[PDB]
């Protein structure tokens, strides 16, 4: 169990976000066309999981775009923008500014992902949503960076997260 | 279980939709501000449950408004607009101008409701979403009308629903 903050209140987050060195667990999440997508179909690539409570709450489009562009400019990298938003809402966010290698995935029917990756908000009003977090997974499916953002509405340390992909 | 259609492909819907003459079961769902709300909140009213696979896809906001308008104009009536969309998406669909007596309610952390009410899509691409359905409940919690819509992307029999409400 972890504690982050929202609206000046403690928020319980289940289990533990994997620390660098951890084997990244398998998952299935849902793509914009409602097909199932697995961690395993990104074999060989490094993966940046940008995880949000929602893409309709608290997030600025232009911020997320800029990170997405910096991330996908790094060699052999895919960004997985993950939230409990249905796929239809994640597609409004991504409108017609989808760059290469930025892939939206929903946890709406794969809640076990949030447990496994230690991002399941367990209480308060955001209960059932993903906490704000960034997990970077290497080409061998080992986590090489993670941040569970302590204040849920603030921005993750995107710089530290990408620095790891240079090495 | 039940069978409806989506893209002319059968879609399995769990359990059974409440039948005419049955008592409506208690539920909790989430309002636009992330508070929980119960069926008990509407004690004394007639309730029209307008149940969607999504509000963000293949639904016409303008046509839903006309129905909401007609329904809410019947005395002692509330329309509960229910989906698995997050409350944030439902609040976009709704606008700053969604009338009184139309409450948006999300099932995203209350999956049991869709099972209880016989509207949980159990397979194919829409798995995890609510089937298209209308359930009318009278002031004494009796289901007086219900429709599980055979073709998911078509409109419910609203006229029939308003008639049972006016009767
Ligand atoms: Cl996998
Ligand atoms: Cl932090
Ligand atoms: Cl952010
Ligand atoms: Cl209740
Ligand atoms: Cl029908």
Curated annotation (Swiss-Prot), chains A, B:
Annotated Gene Ontology cellular component terms: cytosol; periplasmic space
Enzyme Commission (EC) number: 1.11.1.24
Keywords: Antioxidant, Cytoplasm, Disulfide bond, Oxidoreductase, Periplasm, Peroxidase, Redox-active center
UniProt GO MF annotations: hydroperoxide reductase activity; thioredoxin peroxidase activity
Gene3D superfamilies: Glutaredoxin
Domain Thioredoxin intervals: 18-167
Family: Belongs to the peroxiredoxin family. Tpx subfamily.
HAMAP family hit by this protein: Tpx (MF_00269)
UniProt name for this protein: Thiol peroxidase
UniProt source species: Escherichia coli (strain K12)
Gene name linked to the record: tpx
